Amino acid sequence: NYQPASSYIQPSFAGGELAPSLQGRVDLARYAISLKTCRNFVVQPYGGASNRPGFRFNTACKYKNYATRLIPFSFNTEQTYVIEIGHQYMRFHRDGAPVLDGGEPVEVATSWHRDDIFEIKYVQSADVLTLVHPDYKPRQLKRYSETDWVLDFFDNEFGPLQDQNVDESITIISNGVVDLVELTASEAIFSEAMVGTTIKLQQVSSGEVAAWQNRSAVEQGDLAYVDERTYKATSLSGGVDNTLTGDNTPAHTEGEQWDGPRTTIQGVTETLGVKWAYLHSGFGYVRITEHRDDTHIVGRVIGRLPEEIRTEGTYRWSFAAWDSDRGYPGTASYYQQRLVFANSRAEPQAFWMSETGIFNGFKVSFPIEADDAITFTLASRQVNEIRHLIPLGSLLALTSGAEWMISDNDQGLAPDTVSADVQGYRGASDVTPLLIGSSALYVQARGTVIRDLAYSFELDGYTGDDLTIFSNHLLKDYTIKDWAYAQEPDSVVWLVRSDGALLSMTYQREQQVVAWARHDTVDGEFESVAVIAEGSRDVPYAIVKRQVGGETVRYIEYLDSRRFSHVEDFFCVDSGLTYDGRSSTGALLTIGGGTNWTTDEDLTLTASASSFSPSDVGRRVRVYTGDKFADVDVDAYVSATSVAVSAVRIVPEELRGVQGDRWGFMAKTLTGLDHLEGKTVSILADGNVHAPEVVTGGQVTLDYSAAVVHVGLPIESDIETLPISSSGATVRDSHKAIVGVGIQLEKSRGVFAARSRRDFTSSDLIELKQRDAEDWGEATGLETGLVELGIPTSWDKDGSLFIRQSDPLPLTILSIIPRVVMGGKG
Template identity: 35%
Template sequence: MPQRVVQPSFTGGELAPSLHKRSDLAKYSSGLKTCLNFFCHPHGGISNRAGFEFIVETKDSSKASRLIDFQFNADDTYILEFGDQYMRVIRLGAQVELASTPSAWASGTTYAKTDHVSYGGVNYYSKVDSNLGNQPDISPTEWYPLTGLVVEIPTPYLEAELFDIKFTQSADVITLAHKNHPISELSRAGHTLWSLDTITFGANVDAPTGLIATPSGMDDDDLTYYYQVTAVDEDGKESLPSTEASALVDSNWQVGEKVDLSWTAVTGADRYNVYCSRSGLYGYIGTTYGTAFVDTNISPDTSDTPPIAKDPFAFSGDYPGAVGYHQQRLAYASTTNEIEKIIFSRISEFHNLNVSFPQKASDAITMRLNSNEVNEVRHLISMNDLIVMTSGAIWKITSGDNGFSFDNIRAYPQSKSGASNMRPLAVNETVLYTLPKSGVVRDLTYTLEVDGYAGNNLSVMADHMFRGYSMASWAYAQEPDSIVWVVRSDGTMLGLTYLREHQIWGWHRHTTDGYFEDVAVISEGDIDAVYAVVRRTVNGNTVRYIERMHERIDDVVEDAFFVDSGLSYDGAPVTTLAGLDHLEAKSVVALADGNVVRDLTVTSGSITLPYSASKVHVGLEYECDAATLEPPIEGTIGRVKSASRLIVSLLDSRGLWAGPDEDNLVEMKQRYLEAWGDPTELFTGDVEIGIEASWENRGELFLRQKDPLPSTI
């Protein structure tokens, strides 16, 4: 008996083959057998992904590159290309270049770090401050040569180290951590002004100098008092103490006896704290806003002592490999010598690791995660608590409702699964991470029931995408469709449509004529732009391109961009399009004024269209496939069924093919009232497709988009 079957949603994504008979599962009714180059919308439909537009070739295509996002504010957002000992900058879909050729180098001029000059037809970047008299072409320590006008700075990171860099950002500064190098900060002063500097740990304010202690009115001098002074800035940040000064005083101190203290003023100091030692331990005796103080035998408060210098990251083997902010402190973790140790900076003094004795609440904190195994700290994520992900477990470090200080923080294990080295993603109040061995993706969020953190295995319904693979990198694009983009070790891009509050997660696969190697996302206007490093073979050569997923424009067919490594032309009608050197000898497809043009080959960087067009998108072709599961009709799973009629609800679509399988497809006909020569318009509504009935499968349906055109089902 004929039956009507409706699938109203595809939010379950592509399900693993092991689940293709599991019609009892809730996700079965919203799942797909295949979801290739389609993605799931959180509201239920699927669309073919937009194409990737070509941005630029990496500096050295023979080596891998890594993309890191950098957002200063809503307008100033960047993608940073880190390669073998260099960094370049991309902004709003274009490589950042100097506005013009810099001024010529002058031997008598002192240059600051980040200054640019030209010399001998080459542009240079100043690597140091106080750069005077160093001729650029023979001074590699002071000057770094550029390629044309391309903005670039040197870095210490080798190709093999790029994907082990951990980073965190505050305003216009990114802190970069790698165990092989001193921890550094990348700062931005403008689109073309970037500087990478090794962090110098210590107080923000210099210690006072020239301290003199002068006793007066003493009847005897049988006791020695010692003094130190610290400078304090207007934010309350305190320097290290001055060199101590001593004074011989009367052990039977009388009224009128005193010690006069004086010192040299410190730039940036708002006030000064004075400390005195009578028995080996310094204690606070007062504060002054000038550079003099009088001690009239004030009793030292030995619970308040001057800071003690501490720099635990001074030598190789002690460089931290993880970093993260939490409650106005910067946490550093996982050195080669002590992989389980975490050190927190002083409050609001991110480069200050100084302590006091006895310890103060604002002091730097050192802690170790004590467990049965010594596990490497890999990630530090700030939520309500600090989430610490190690190679063998996940912990929360909490201070409850109190301040985050040495005397009230506690560490509690949350999971024994551990995390891989790939940087976790913060998705609203949830953290996504991958397991260290299998690459399985899990989420983690606070649960009131257990007063801790727990989550779900997000890979279990699509485990075929993870078995035998590792995950190379990932990034989260919140707008417009809340998708996590994941680069797999074989060069496939996976997508996870994820909306935890509605219990939505569905996986989809994405391929191209090449291999995805890295992905990053940055806010650009009203969308989160997806950038990728793609390794391709062009004209017999291996090349690596940085490409950007185009906005999915599907309301005007002429604007549809559904080609990879593509470029666009918008101008007077032409038949020849140049500037395609990056696709030399490749077979490409074009959408010219809304019409599909095939059988094009790039020759000498150009293609020739069969007719003139004013708006053209040219690039590599890719097909998009979606296949349904066996209809969940009660009592029929596993039985042969035939589907002969298909009604598809479409939104702004054109060019879809459908059938019982990929070898028996019928094109959806939709040209109705368009004038002769005009492109077929996009269609919204229900369309019936007559497909050939077949008793050779179990009622599954196959849909394909072959053309560079939008399809939303």
């Protein structure tokens, strides 16, 4: 016989978590490159798997039992912030710390109700942020200082209006012509919801208005018109009985231009020339300010009403589209130097685009100039209320029934040339779409499904494919709550399941990588997630519900960095703080009074610039140099710079005389943990795991000195692979037995492994043994490369491994070599 053990290397984990229903598709590469359980282990494009770094505790926000949300905001590339929105308030954050102002956070009072904040849709343009909501007036947010912020309303000058009232019977009569004027209508049309708007009144015609015959005698006050423009004379050149009009037709839309050179014309013996002040060109908007009845409203006139409404009364009135009853914009975006607002409550399937350049106006002119305002209405089939505009290759509109594309055909954007086309019928939820490459990720309507969107030179139309096909179990009986895209360290999409569970993507379309990963935190739930710039690393910010002290608190969270050349710099605790003290700012130390001794030797320590005080006596100071370190106790104060220190171990020879690159004191009692009051927090001191101690009173005592301590909630991370099976003549039915495992860790320490039996318990885990040189006092170092570890074996039919790490250390699995021996069938 002598059939040796066999190895079945799995190069990648890019498949991510594989749904239980998918476990019978061995004929696909996903089965070969996926994992059945990947808790707290973010895949990596390259196909690795690294335990998620811990969430650093920033602070609690307010209103423990109220809703909250985060959005990303920027002040150009000068700085980035994180707005926090709750019940009728607003705060700011940066660098995982509150925006301090007088020892208190900066708050901007808001009107949004707590339940409605999640439906807020936002955009950004340089130093201006815009928030819209169907039930709230839009409020543009602008920043004037880090300690001074202002949230103003959106002033829609000549705001969008419905089509003119073709109902001829109803008419409106205005008492005055300029300034404070009282209106009157022949029907009950006005409402007390129009308290502040911008209505429009256009003259029926120029009845009771004199024409503009070429050469005529006029009076000091006239009201003549030429074409759609009513001018008023203000002066005459010669005598009142000797002045005529002239040939220069009035063409100005403002001013008082003449129409004759105040002189004779051959032999007409008149003096010619007449002033012509411009007046109402047919219409004038009235900004309503008061309500009296359904037939009586009062407002101020922006320009000037023609006298026809004063005397005859016009019928061509256009009520403003946006008010407090028909609704407000439900979504917004920018496009071709125009602001686009959409989804009013009364008129959902419509978007209004401002004129080119004037982001806060919606004027429309009679000649229909190209750069006037825009108004469209997507109808097609089914309800198609617009929810998301995104410029990808054109303005795209994602609606509840379809995914429209808006386009200018091929000439230009104008009220006449603007068109709209359908790209499919799948819908989209209210969740803000995400932007990745030349593709747009958008939640499919009704949640539970994630669809991407991009162009396709197969159908000449923006279309996409499902991303939840391989991990539907993670989302099917759940609904997505939020999103984010931390493209820089790893193209990961963080989203929240409405259960409080956080899931991650590893989306990279160019390399066909879609990896899912279920995450979790101890005694906690996730609420909202957003990412900002944060230097050179996209740092997500999350709202985490917790049950600290029998109360449902809400903390601010942000995912730490995976950058650490030494294990002591790692961070794998949820809502954990750091007590690092590796200060090297002009304070470089050197131990003197002898070299390379064995404690009890009266060794001298010196500092470059003070950095020592008599109160610091009895406190232990570490001195670093490269990787090596040493510990010495302060015994006496010789000077503010020079002191005597007693070693605790032999100072390593390569750490003598030469000036240590960095140093720092060590603490034993740690405070400021009231936010984790009464938790079984885990500790990590200088790359060494410390016994858990329950936070009592907000202080944690350590069993030894420690330069760097990371303290917080423990993290449970699990990997468990698919059962061994193959196509054709399968081996799934065959009995299997795994005896050893080659893992190929890289920059990792502390891997546990076992067999994935049904009765699996934490007590049978076998953990790796790595301590070869590892000098006294030095923590166990990082390990990179293949390591072969054996496990207790059984003869189950699952044939699945199980890798767990419950302690705060780095773990990174690049592959798996399960030492497998085949058995027999049933």
